């Protein structure tokens, strides 16, 4: 029981294909795939690779205010299929956008991480190191050392 047309396989294979695809676009761990899934993956990388060369698209993905990457995703996903049509090309392009969204999200999430870690370091500095730093006449002490 449970072949390709079942919702279970669709979600399972879908998850493996998307995860594999995203990790694949992030090159510029891996994922476990049986033979046919691997075949599907090649039939996705080709399209991903072509889309990577669409310079205009890249600029517009870069320009998106991603204060809310989730809103962005669903607005794009909704607008894409709003005419009521489907084909594999659209599904793949949607998968392409998701992988790009990951890369974009880091580009917004990562400054945040630095500020946070900086927060800890400077908190510690103010409370634990500053007295000693003042005794050196501040950071000008380090030029000498």
């Amino acid at each position: 029981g449970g072949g390709p047309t079942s919702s279970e396989q669709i979600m399972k294979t879908g998850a493996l294909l998307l995860q594999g695809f995203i990790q694949d676009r992030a090159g510029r761990d891996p994922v476990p795939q049986d033979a046919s899934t691997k075949k599907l993956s090649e039939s996705l990388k080709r399209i991903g690779d072509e889309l990577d060369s669409n310079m205009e698209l890249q600029r517009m993905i870069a320009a998106v205010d991603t204060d809310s990457p989730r809103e962005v995703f669903f607005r794009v996903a909704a607008d894409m299929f709003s005419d009521g049509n489907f084909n594999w090309g659209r599904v793949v392009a949607l998968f392409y956008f998701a992988s790009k969204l990951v890369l974009k999200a880091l580009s917004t999430k990562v400054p945040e991480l630095i500020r946070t870690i900086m927060g800890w370091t400077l908190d510690f500095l103010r409370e634990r190191l500053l007295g000693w730093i003042q005794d050196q006449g501040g950071w000008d002490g380090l030029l000498s050392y």
Binding site: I47, N54, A63, V64, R75, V76, G89, L94
Partner: peptide
């Protein structure tokens, strides 16, 4: 702009 991206992915998807 989100929309530019949507129309372009549709166009690209359909063209494939």
């Amino acid at each position: 702009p989100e929309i530019w991206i949507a129309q372009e992915l549709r166009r690209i998807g359909d063209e494939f």
